[PDB]
Structure formats: structure tokens, C-alpha cells
Design an enzyme around this catalytic site. Structure first.
Site, PDB file in Angstrom:
ATOM      1  N   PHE A 111      12.923  28.830  30.529  1.00  0.00           N
ATOM      2  CA  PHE A 111      14.003  29.841  30.436  1.00  0.00           C
ATOM      3  C   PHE A 111      13.327  31.180  30.105  1.00  0.00           C
ATOM      4  CE2 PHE A 111      18.593  30.348  28.464  1.00  0.00           C
ATOM      5  CZ  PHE A 111      18.798  31.486  29.204  1.00  0.00           C
ATOM      6  N   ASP A 147      47.534  40.631  27.628  1.00  0.00           N
ATOM      7  CA  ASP A 147      46.423  39.640  27.665  1.00  0.00           C
ATOM      8  C   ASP A 147      45.665  39.658  26.334  1.00  0.00           C
ATOM      9  OD1 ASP A 147      46.711  38.543  30.245  1.00  0.00           O
ATOM     10  OD2 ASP A 147      45.325  39.999  31.109  1.00  0.00           O
ATOM     11  N   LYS A 185      22.754  30.086  24.992  1.00  0.00           N
ATOM     12  CA  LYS A 185      23.988  29.272  25.047  1.00  0.00           C
ATOM     13  C   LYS A 185      23.810  28.093  24.109  1.00  0.00           C
ATOM     14  CE  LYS A 185      26.224  28.910  28.942  1.00  0.00           C
ATOM     15  NZ  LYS A 185      26.539  28.454  30.317  1.00  0.00           N
ATOM     16  N   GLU A 192      36.286  46.950  33.630  1.00  0.00           N
ATOM     17  CA  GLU A 192      35.483  45.752  33.981  1.00  0.00           C
ATOM     18  C   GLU A 192      34.008  46.159  34.023  1.00  0.00           C
ATOM     19  OE1 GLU A 192      37.510  43.577  33.577  1.00  0.00           O
ATOM     20  OE2 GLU A 192      39.378  43.964  34.723  1.00  0.00           O
ATOM     21  N   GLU A 204      40.052  51.160  35.730  1.00  0.00           N
ATOM     22  CA  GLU A 204      41.051  52.241  35.639  1.00  0.00           C
ATOM     23  C   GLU A 204      41.135  52.708  34.191  1.00  0.00           C
ATOM     24  OE1 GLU A 204      42.269  48.942  36.597  1.00  0.00           O
ATOM     25  OE2 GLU A 204      41.258  49.320  38.528  1.00  0.00           O
ATOM     26  N   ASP A 214      27.473  37.447  30.954  1.00  0.00           N
ATOM     27  CA  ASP A 214      28.947  37.619  30.856  1.00  0.00           C
ATOM     28  C   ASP A 214      29.297  38.309  29.539  1.00  0.00           C
ATOM     29  OD1 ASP A 214      29.615  36.337  33.293  1.00  0.00           O
ATOM     30  OD2 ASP A 214      29.767  34.387  32.261  1.00  0.00           O
ATOM     31  N   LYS A 215      28.619  37.931  28.458  1.00  0.00           N
ATOM     32  CA  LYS A 215      28.911  38.506  27.124  1.00  0.00           C
ATOM     33  C   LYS A 215      28.400  39.949  27.050  1.00  0.00           C
ATOM     34  CE  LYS A 215      31.757  36.363  24.638  1.00  0.00           C
ATOM     35  NZ  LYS A 215      32.619  37.546  24.870  1.00  0.00           N
ATOM     36  N   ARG A 225      34.669  36.369  31.699  1.00  0.00           N
ATOM     37  CA  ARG A 225      34.211  35.056  32.226  1.00  0.00           C
ATOM     38  C   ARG A 225      33.772  34.145  31.072  1.00  0.00           C
ATOM     39  NH1 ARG A 225      32.724  34.596  37.894  1.00  0.00           N
ATOM     40  NH2 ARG A 225      31.333  32.936  37.147  1.00  0.00           N
ATOM     41  N   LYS A 226      34.131  34.495  29.833  1.00  0.00           N
ATOM     42  CA  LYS A 226      33.895  33.670  28.621  1.00  0.00           C
ATOM     43  C   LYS A 226      35.191  33.560  27.819  1.00  0.00           C
ATOM     44  CE  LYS A 226      29.891  32.170  29.341  1.00  0.00           C
ATOM     45  NZ  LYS A 226      30.429  32.101  30.716  1.00  0.00           N
ATOM     46  N   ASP A 268      21.198  35.464  36.090  1.00  0.00           N
ATOM     47  CA  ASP A 268      22.602  35.067  36.364  1.00  0.00           C
ATOM     48  C   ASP A 268      23.492  36.307  36.304  1.00  0.00           C
ATOM     49  OD1 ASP A 268      24.923  33.388  36.682  1.00  0.00           O
ATOM     50  OD2 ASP A 268      25.134  33.325  34.493  1.00  0.00           O
ATOM     51  N   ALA A 269      24.248  36.597  37.362  1.00  0.00           N
ATOM     52  CA  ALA A 269      25.174  37.754  37.367  1.00  0.00           C
ATOM     53  C   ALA A 269      26.221  37.548  36.275  1.00  0.00           C
ATOM     54  CB  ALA A 269      25.829  37.944  38.711  1.00  0.00           C
ATOM     55  N   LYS A 291      47.868  46.121  27.378  1.00  0.00           N
ATOM     56  CA  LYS A 291      47.528  44.874  28.101  1.00  0.00           C
ATOM     57  C   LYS A 291      47.779  43.702  27.147  1.00  0.00           C
ATOM     58  CE  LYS A 291      45.489  48.103  30.762  1.00  0.00           C
ATOM     59  NZ  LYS A 291      45.771  49.540  30.546  1.00  0.00           N
ATOM     60  N   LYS A 328      40.237  46.298  27.553  1.00  0.00           N
ATOM     61  CA  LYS A 328      41.709  46.504  27.660  1.00  0.00           C
ATOM     62  C   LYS A 328      42.276  47.113  26.371  1.00  0.00           C
ATOM     63  CE  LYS A 328      42.190  42.585  30.807  1.00  0.00           C
ATOM     64  NZ  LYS A 328      42.866  41.295  31.033  1.00  0.00           N
ATOM     65  N   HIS A 388      23.778  36.849  26.702  1.00  0.00           N
ATOM     66  CA  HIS A 388      24.358  36.104  27.845  1.00  0.00           C
ATOM     67  C   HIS A 388      24.996  37.124  28.785  1.00  0.00           C
ATOM     68  CE1 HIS A 388      26.201  32.801  30.066  1.00  0.00           C
ATOM     69  NE2 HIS A 388      27.143  33.731  30.255  1.00  0.00           N
TER      70      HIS A 388
HETATM   71  C1  LIG Z   1      22.430  28.293  34.465  1.00  0.00           C
HETATM   72  S1  LIG Z   1      22.955  29.974  34.743  1.00  0.00           S
HETATM   73  C2  LIG Z   1      24.285  29.723  35.967  1.00  0.00           C
HETATM   74  C3  LIG Z   1      23.794  29.290  37.323  1.00  0.00           C
HETATM   75  C4  LIG Z   1      23.069  30.413  38.073  1.00  0.00           C
HETATM   76  N1  LIG Z   1      24.001  31.492  38.484  1.00  0.00           N
HETATM   77  C5  LIG Z   1      22.387  29.838  39.315  1.00  0.00           C
HETATM   78  O1  LIG Z   1      22.067  30.627  40.211  1.00  0.00           O
HETATM   79  O2  LIG Z   1      22.161  28.623  39.412  1.00  0.00           O
HETATM   80  C6  LIG Z   1      24.200  30.215  33.474  1.00  0.00           C
HETATM   81  C7  LIG Z   1      23.653  30.677  32.158  1.00  0.00           C
HETATM   82  O3  LIG Z   1      22.669  29.727  31.699  1.00  0.00           O
HETATM   83  C8  LIG Z   1      21.639  30.417  31.042  1.00  0.00           C
HETATM   84  N2  LIG Z   1      20.388  30.213  31.761  1.00  0.00           N
HETATM   85  C9  LIG Z   1      19.771  31.053  32.654  1.00  0.00           C
HETATM   86  N3  LIG Z   1      18.614  30.609  33.082  1.00  0.00           N
HETATM   87  C10 LIG Z   1      18.434  29.426  32.385  1.00  0.00           C
HETATM   88  C11 LIG Z   1      17.376  28.500  32.354  1.00  0.00           C
HETATM   89  N4  LIG Z   1      16.262  28.633  33.071  1.00  0.00           N
HETATM   90  N5  LIG Z   1      17.499  27.444  31.510  1.00  0.00           N
HETATM   91  C12 LIG Z   1      18.619  27.318  30.794  1.00  0.00           C
HETATM   92  N6  LIG Z   1      19.683  28.116  30.753  1.00  0.00           N
HETATM   93  C13 LIG Z   1      19.518  29.172  31.562  1.00  0.00           C
HETATM   94  C14 LIG Z   1      22.071  31.877  30.936  1.00  0.00           C
HETATM   95  O4  LIG Z   1      22.792  32.060  29.737  1.00  0.00           O
HETATM   96  C15 LIG Z   1      22.958  32.030  32.171  1.00  0.00           C
HETATM   97  O5  LIG Z   1      23.939  33.059  32.042  1.00  0.00           O
HETATM   98  C1  LIG Z   2      49.258  45.409  36.139  1.00  0.00           C
HETATM   99  S1  LIG Z   2      47.654  45.319  36.910  1.00  0.00           S
HETATM  100  C2  LIG Z   2      46.572  45.205  35.445  1.00  0.00           C
HETATM  101  C3  LIG Z   2      46.494  46.475  34.642  1.00  0.00           C
HETATM  102  C4  LIG Z   2      45.707  47.578  35.360  1.00  0.00           C
HETATM  103  N1  LIG Z   2      44.262  47.256  35.448  1.00  0.00           N
HETATM  104  C5  LIG Z   2      45.882  48.900  34.610  1.00  0.00           C
HETATM  105  O1  LIG Z   2      45.058  49.795  34.826  1.00  0.00           O
HETATM  106  O2  LIG Z   2      46.823  49.063  33.820  1.00  0.00           O
HETATM  107  C6  LIG Z   2      47.442  43.557  37.176  1.00  0.00           C
HETATM  108  C7  LIG Z   2      48.014  43.059  38.468  1.00  0.00           C
HETATM  109  O3  LIG Z   2      49.416  43.392  38.519  1.00  0.00           O
HETATM  110  C8  LIG Z   2      49.761  43.711  39.842  1.00  0.00           C
HETATM  111  N2  LIG Z   2      50.210  45.095  39.903  1.00  0.00           N
HETATM  112  C9  LIG Z   2      49.504  46.205  40.295  1.00  0.00           C
HETATM  113  N3  LIG Z   2      50.213  47.307  40.301  1.00  0.00           N
HETATM  114  C10 LIG Z   2      51.482  46.886  39.940  1.00  0.00           C
HETATM  115  C11 LIG Z   2      52.703  47.572  39.813  1.00  0.00           C
HETATM  116  N4  LIG Z   2      52.842  48.876  40.044  1.00  0.00           N
HETATM  117  N5  LIG Z   2      53.796  46.839  39.477  1.00  0.00           N
HETATM  118  C12 LIG Z   2      53.648  45.532  39.247  1.00  0.00           C
HETATM  119  N6  LIG Z   2      52.551  44.785  39.322  1.00  0.00           N
HETATM  120  C13 LIG Z   2      51.496  45.524  39.697  1.00  0.00           C
HETATM  121  C14 LIG Z   2      48.544  43.407  40.711  1.00  0.00           C
HETATM  122  O4  LIG Z   2      48.608  42.066  41.146  1.00  0.00           O
HETATM  123  C15 LIG Z   2      47.395  43.639  39.730  1.00  0.00           C
HETATM  124  O5  LIG Z   2      46.216  42.903  40.053  1.00  0.00           O
HETATM  125 CL   LIG Z   3      27.477  30.660  32.259  1.00  0.00          CL
HETATM  126 CL   LIG Z   4      28.154  30.917  35.638  1.00  0.00          CL
HETATM  127 CL   LIG Z   5      43.885  42.270  34.625  1.00  0.00          CL
END
Ligand SMILES: C[S@@+](CC[C@H](N)C(=O)[O-])C[C@H]1O[C@@H](n2cnc3c(N)ncnc32)[C@H](O)[C@@H]1O
Ligand SMILES: C[S@@+](CC[C@H](N)C(=O)[O-])C[C@H]1O[C@@H](n2cnc3c(N)ncnc32)[C@H](O)[C@@H]1O
Ligand SMILES: [Cl-]
Ligand SMILES: [Cl-]
Ligand SMILES: [Cl-]
Ligand SMILES: CC(C)n1ncc2c(C(=O)Nc3ccc4nn(C)cc4c3)cc(C3CC3)nc21
Ligand SMILES: CC(C)n1ncc2c(C(=O)Nc3ccc4nn(C)cc4c3)cc(C3CC3)nc21
Ligand SMILES: [Cl-]
Ligand SMILES: [Cl-]
Ligand SMILES: [Cl-]
Ligand SMILES: [Cl-]
Ligand SMILES: [Cl-]
Lengths: 382, 382
Positions: free
Chosen positions: B237, B278, B168, B44, B57, B18-19, B251-252, B245-246, B276, B272, B16
């Protein structure tokens, strides 16, 4: 006191790098819908130092100037100079956009009656409403949003000209349990972090955030001698926006919804047309939840729905009323089934989801403001 | 029957898009931690046709071959040929990585005792546990995960060689309400969508998904004549993975956690390091929730925590036991405060969060498997 608990929600400003991506994704969606109401849009945005990347799938009759749409969105947010770490005039805009997968198109919408269009994907979506505010939203997320809106207001009117667009806020409320409903007692803790210029000192910023931001937003009745303030707790936030932290579309889904209250199915809203049930079904579920609370059937309610790609009707509908209705969850489910049609091809008609109003949704939460169609409760027959 | 309700959870396969991004982000994290246990990593990943982009970063003493780490992760997932829509050998790997913001570094960890390191960000995080399975996870998400694991197994062993890595799944269970706990009754609906080759016909795929995947995963006692099967519901499919699909990291987040059960604070895990919250605080909150249920103090429990950037101690801790304890939520909160230290600089010691085991977490959910440290309950003193 027994029967009390803390709950924390956060919000982010328009210049938060993830929120930049949401707004750009929805700016692109709106640009397409302005020319082609049936545009199929799956536009992801990525933001890092000097870069907006668009990635995804768009099938549209629209002629869209991506350079203009992206740069105008960044201008509105307020990134207009290298001194602020990002500039709409001089940043890189990269495009990796292709047509929608014909395999998705044939499975979802090609040769289908609009009412009987398939869900654009599988997935689960929740709607939530709470009587604790008039707008039927948790106080924690409402206050967190308003603190970011206040920062943007004082930046844009020039009263705190040291402010930059990137901000985050966090509000902890002490609540009283009330027969499954919740009553806000006091604000326990506030966090504000906001990007700033090199001239302003930490003490000036902290004084301003308390006196001009918090006191301008949070009613005094919620604040007391014990309220904890974490204002610029990092001590320095000059580097900000995409330069400080990479942003992506759909990485603020809890900020976008209920601030951790209710529930979430995982789907991102921004950059998606109505055939993506991640957005349309979540808006519809909010609409159902708010209709149940405003209809006086419950004080608090959660709606779950789910879909299969290519299938119109939800696979499942579930109602959880937190014990805040005299009616059973079964009776509320029957009322929902009698009053709502949660096919995406019907939701689009009821909520006017071809209208290019999506960039407006992509900051300060999608719910509880501006009387969007999903915020106007439906009169229920039962 | 009254007192019953439906609940739906989804999962996705390793392919997938995103995965893919989550696994690459954690492959990069692990590569850094292998050489520098104190690497600051915010990686990311973005995936579209022919492209892996790394954005974020990293401040690390590690020498990491990003080309090797990314391509080896894509190889493991099984994207090894243009015929499958993506190939680790020939795809573009773009890198937009910079050092961690010195403003973040100075606010969070520079010149700080490890135990007293600041949270790497503000935010809220939830932990959940439910006695409905031995591993203290919702049955819906467990089954959805296992269906994706079964697809990967039958692809890798060559019994269904038409399978591609992108999949999925979605499972709807009918539950009985049991004094605030939940008892699974039956599987109401199953969705499986999986990418496939051009040779295999829809009927062969649907037969195989029922007989070789569903019957191999879901106990027969949960399946009946009324169970609904949506197998390859799109009808086609062939186009899949990033081409279809990007994909983006984080995003999961609901697939990664409880499949919509419990609650979510919005934070992504993958890419992370432990600073972090999170990730680290969500792992710690799962650990607390599972310790309360395995300790016999409750059948079901939700833990909320929150942080401010630069502050060690959580701002708020909250316990919600769904009415499944004889002890009050206040008493459980006091037990948690006596037994746990939720500073990120202590969590890292208790859960061994400098160990490069993160790529293992980035598919099939972060919770309820493999006896990761956060899945080994703490013996509680009270
Ligand atoms: C349906 S796509 C999301 C919508 C897509 N970005 C679009 O442009 O409509 C989301 C996920 O569904 C799955 N997918 C992709 N193509 C598919 C298809 N033809 N049939 C069913 N699932 C599909 C993949 O896992 C994909 O990441
Ligand atoms: C703390 S950063 C996430 C961690 C970061 N990616 C890293 O490299 O550690 C998350 C969000 O906190 C905020 N942020 C960025 N720099 C910060 C700072 N110096 N002090 C406090 N919040 C900050 C921004 O909104 C940013 O999108
Ligand atoms: Cl999806
Ligand atoms: Cl999606
Ligand atoms: Cl973040
Ligand atoms: C799933 C998450 C977002 N979620 N959903 C509800 C709650 C509550 C909650 O509603 N508690 C209440 C409220 C009213 C009451 N009346 N009575 C008699 C008992 C009650 C208990 C609490 C928490 C804290 C953060 C753990 N999370 C919740
Ligand atoms: C916030 C979301 C994920 N969330 N959190 C709990 C639930 C429940 C739920 O637990 N219902 C129950 C369970 C046991 C019971 N015993 N008694 C006497 C009454 C009960 C009610 C239901 C739903 C459906 C999807 C709307 N969502 C929930
Ligand atoms: Cl607002
Ligand atoms: Cl009522
Ligand atoms: Cl963030
Ligand atoms: Cl598994
Ligand atoms: Cl007990």
C-alpha cells in the site's frame, strides 16, 4: 390505529444528475466487458453544466471510445438539446483515467486462481427481502421507481412533451406491523418533482402528474381523500439535470437498493467490475435474502457480509429475520453457509458478473426487476 | 452461544480520497459561512492523481480564495510531498462552481421567513441512538474511527514516520441480544490497511499495527486468542490517496453515520448549508434519537423523517424502538411531536447550523463526539 407506522422511500429518473453519472459509469464498464470480460474497472463520473468527467482506474485489453460511450448514454437518457439544459452532441467529455494501482492489483488478483481472488476492497454489504410484494421489495421503493419510469414513458411517447429527463419521486406508505412482517395499508404522501419546458403552466403539470402518472402507477385501493400530494412543490423546475445540480457516481446508493429499508454498507455499485465486493457481494446478499424468503424460511430477512482487501472468504456473515422465521437466526446462518459460497471468484460464476448488463441496473434500482441472476432464488438444501 | 450475532462497521482516515473530498467540501462551506452565514452552498469535491475539482452551486456574499481553502485542507490532512503521492503545494485545483439555480432559490428560500424556509430538497433521513456506549453510538463504528484517529496521531507525532494519510479500518464485534438492546461481548475481527513508505517492511508494519494501534485503542477485555487480525492484508500500500483511488464527496455516508447500524436515507452531509435537509434533518434526527435514549425512554431507537422541496414541515415522522421502551412507538412519536420542531428554519436555530464548524465533522463520523449541538440531549416534557 395502534400497530401502524409510516415509512418513506424516494427514487429518481434517468436524467437526475447523480443517476446520469451511474448510467455513464456502467456504460463505460459494459464497453470494457464487451471486449475484455476480465477488465478491472473503477470508473467514477462527475456531471455539471456542459461537462461529463470520467475519473478513476481501468486496466483492460479493450479499445473503448469514451466520447462515443458517454455521448450515446446521455442521448439514451434524452439530453439532446441546449433547450433542455444538456446536449450529448455538444457537451464536454473530460477523461482522467489511469491503470489500476499495481499495489491493489498484486494484493487482489495478480497470479490468483479466479475462485480464490481477493476481495477488491474491505467493506460491509447487506441483502434484504420482504414478502410484502411478489418481487420481494418494499412497496414504497417499488412505487417510487414506477412513478419515475412512468414519467420517462410519457416523455418518450410524446403524451407529455413538456417533460424533461430529470425527476424525483417520494412515496410514504402507512404499514401494519404483522408479527415482524409488514402489510401496506395506504399511500399517505406522494412527492413528484420533474424538470419541464417554459411553455407548460403549473396547473396543467399538477393535473397531468395526478391523472396520467400517479393514477397510472399506484393502485386506487392505496389512495383516498386523505392522501397528500406534493406535485411540482418547488413551483418551477425549468433548469435541471447537471445544470441545476452537480451529479456524481454512487450518490443514490439508497435509491439503488431498498429505499431506506433493510440496511446499507456504504458501497456504490456503478462503474465497478465483480472484484469490487461493494457490487458483487451486495448482489450475492440480495440473492441469499430473496432465496430465504422465496424458500419459505422467513417473511422478511437481512443478510450482512464483510470482506478484507486481498481475502477471498467473507470475514463475517449475519442473519436478522425480524422474528419472521420459526428457525433461529443461527439455523438460517447454517443454511446460508451450506448453500452459498460468497467468495467474489465464485459469485462471478453464479451471477454471471462478467456479462455487460450493468447499464440496465443503473436506473430504477438494482433489485426487484427483470429477473437478473441475483433475483432468481436458489433452491436450498437443509 | 445462541442469542449472539456478528456486526461489522468500517471507518477511513483523513487521507482516504473520499474523505479528502468531504473535508475540502466542508472547508469551502466553512470559508463561506465565516463571511456570509446565509451562504447557499452545494460544493462537491472530486480527487484523482494531482487534481482537486470543485463542482456545484454556491450563492454567497463571501469572497473565498478556493486555491487557499483547498490547499490548506490538503496540508492539514498531511499530503505535502510527491513522495506521498499528493502535494497541496503543487496539485491542480479546478473550479466548476456556479450560482444556485434560481428555480431552486425561488422554490426554497427567496422571500420566505427563515422559520418557514422550504426544505432544500425532498428526501428521507434517519437518526439512531444505542445505550451500548456512553456517547450512544455502536461500539463497532466507535472502535473503527478510533483506530484511524490513532494512525493519524502516530503519523503526526513521528512515532510511525512510515505512515501516510490514507487508511481504512474495519471492526467485527460479537454481540449478545438483550431484549431488543445489544451488549458487546468480544472483537471477532479487525482489518487495518494504511498507506506507507517504501522503506518499512510488512512485518514491522503488522507488529506496529497490533502493538501501537490496536492495543492502544481496543480494550484487552474484547480481545482474545481467537480474535482475527487482517493487518496490511493487501501486502503493499505505497500508492495511496487520490493516486490509488478516485475520491468524491458523499461516498462515505455510512462511515459518516452509524457504520451500517440504524438506517440511512442516502443523503451526503459535506459541502451543504443547513437548507439541505440531507444534513440538517439527519443532525436533528440524531438529536431526537439521543434525547430519547439519554431521557431513559428507550435503550435503542431509530427516527425516520422525510421532506418535499419547498415545504417546511416533515411529510412523515416514524419511531422504531426495537422493543426497548415500555412506551408504544405511537407514545414516543407524540413525545417527539410535543418536544421538537423539525422545520429546517427551526433546526438551524436549535443546532446553530450557520456556525462554520463543518470541516470538524467531515472525518471520524458526524455523531458521538465533541458535544456538537446535536449530541447535547434535549430535556423532554411529557
Ligand atoms: C481498494 S481501493 C478501491 C478500488 C480501486 N478504485 C481499484 O481501482 O481497484 C479503495 C480504498 O482502499 C485503500 N487502498 C488503496 N490502495 C490500497 C492497497 N494497495 N492496499 C490496501 N488498501 C488500499 C484506499 O483507502 C482506497 O481509497
Ligand atoms: C434540489 S437539487 C439539490 C440542491 C442544489 N445542489 C442546490 O444548489 O440547492 C437536487 C435535485 O432536485 C431536483 N431539482 C433541481 N432543480 C429543482 C427544482 N427547481 N425544483 C425541484 N426539484 C429540483 C434535481 O433532481 C436535482 O438533482
Ligand atoms: Cl473505498
Ligand atoms: Cl471505492
Ligand atoms: Cl444533492
Ligand atoms: C432499520 C430500518 C430500515 N427499519 N427496519 C425495520 C423497521 C421498522 C419495522 O420493521 N417495524 C416493525 C415491523 C413489524 C413489526 N411487527 N411487530 C410485532 C413489531 C414490528 C415493528 C420500522 C421502521 C420505522 C422507520 C422507523 N424502520 C425500520
Ligand atoms: C437494519 C440493521 C442495521 N439491523 N438493525 C438491527 C439489527 C440486528 C439486531 O438488532 N438484532 C437483535 C438485537 C437484539 C435483540 N434482542 N432480541 C430478543 C432479538 C434481537 C435481535 C442485527 C443485524 C444483523 C446484521 C444482520 N442487523 C440489524
Ligand atoms: Cl420500474
Ligand atoms: Cl419458518
Ligand atoms: Cl439529490
Ligand atoms: Cl475518534
Ligand atoms: Cl421505558
Amino acid at each position: 390505529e395502534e400497530g401502524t407506522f409510516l415509512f418513506t422511500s424516494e427514487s429518481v429518473g434517468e436524467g437526475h444528475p447523480d443517476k446520469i453519472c451511474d448510467q455513464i459509469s456502467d456504460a463505460v464498464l459494459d464497453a470494457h466487458l464487451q471486449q475484455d470480460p476480465d477488465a478491472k474497472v473503477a470508473c467514477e463520473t462527475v456531471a455539471k453544466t456542459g461537462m461529463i468527467l470520467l475519473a478513476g482506474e481501468i486496466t483492460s485489453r479493450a479499445a473503448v471510445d469514451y466520447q462515443k460511450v458517454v455521448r450515446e448514454a446521455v442521448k439514451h437518457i434524452g439530453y439532446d438539446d441546449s433547450s433542455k439544459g444538456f446536449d450529448y452532441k455538444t457537451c464536454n467529455v473530460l477523461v482522467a483515467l489511469e491503470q489500476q494501482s499495481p499495489d491493489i492489483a498484486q494484493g487482489v488478483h495478480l497470479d490468483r486462481n479466479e475462485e480464490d481472488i481477493g476481495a477488491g476492497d474491505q467493506g460491509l454489504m447487506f441483502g434484504y427481502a420482504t414478502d410484502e410484494t411478489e418481487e420481494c421489495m418494499p412497496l414504497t421503493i417499488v412505487l417510487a421507481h414506477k412513478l419515475n419510469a412512468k414519467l420517462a414513458e410519457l416523455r418518450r411517447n410524446g403524451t407529455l412533451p413538456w417533460l424533461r429527463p430529470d425527476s424525483k419521486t417520494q412515496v410514504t406508505v402507512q404499514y401494519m406491523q404483522d408479527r415482524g412482517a409488514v402489510l401496506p395499508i395506504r399511500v399517505h404522501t406522494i412527492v413528484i418533482s420533474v424538470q419541464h419546458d417554459e411553455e407548460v403552466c403549473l396547473d396543467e403539470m399538477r393535473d397531468a402528474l395526478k391523472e396520467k402518472v400517479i393514477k397510472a402507477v399506484v393502485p386506487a385501493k392505496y389512495l383516498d381523500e386523505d392522501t397528500i400530494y406534493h406535485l411540482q412543490p418547488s413551483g418551477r423546475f425549468v433548469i435541471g439535470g447537471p445544470q441545476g445540480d452537480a451529479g456524481l457516481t454512487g450518490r443514490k446508493i439508497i435509491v439503488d437498493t431498498y429505499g431506506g429499508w433493510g440496511a446499507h454498507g456504504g458501497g456504490a455499485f456503478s462503474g465497478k467490475d465483480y472484484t469490487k465486493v461493494d457490487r458483487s457481494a451486495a448482489y450475492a446478499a440480495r440473492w441469499v435474502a430473496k432465496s430465504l424468503v422465496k424458500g419459505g424460511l422467513c417473511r422478511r430477512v437481512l443478510v450482512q457480509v464483510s470482506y478484507a482487501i486481498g481475502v477471498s472468504h467473507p470475514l463475517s456473515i449475519s442473519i436478522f429475520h425480524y422474528g419472521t422465521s420459526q428457525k433461529s437466526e443461527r439455523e438460517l446462518l447454517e443454511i446460508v453457509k451450506k448453500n452459498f459460497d460468497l467468495r467474489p471468484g465464485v459469485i462471478v460464476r453464479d451471477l454471471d458478473l462478467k456479462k455487460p448488463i450493468y447499464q440496465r441496473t443503473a436506473a430504477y434500482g438494482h433489485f426487484g426487476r427483470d429477473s437478473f441472476p441475483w433475483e432468481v432464488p436458489k433452491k436450498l438444501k437443509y
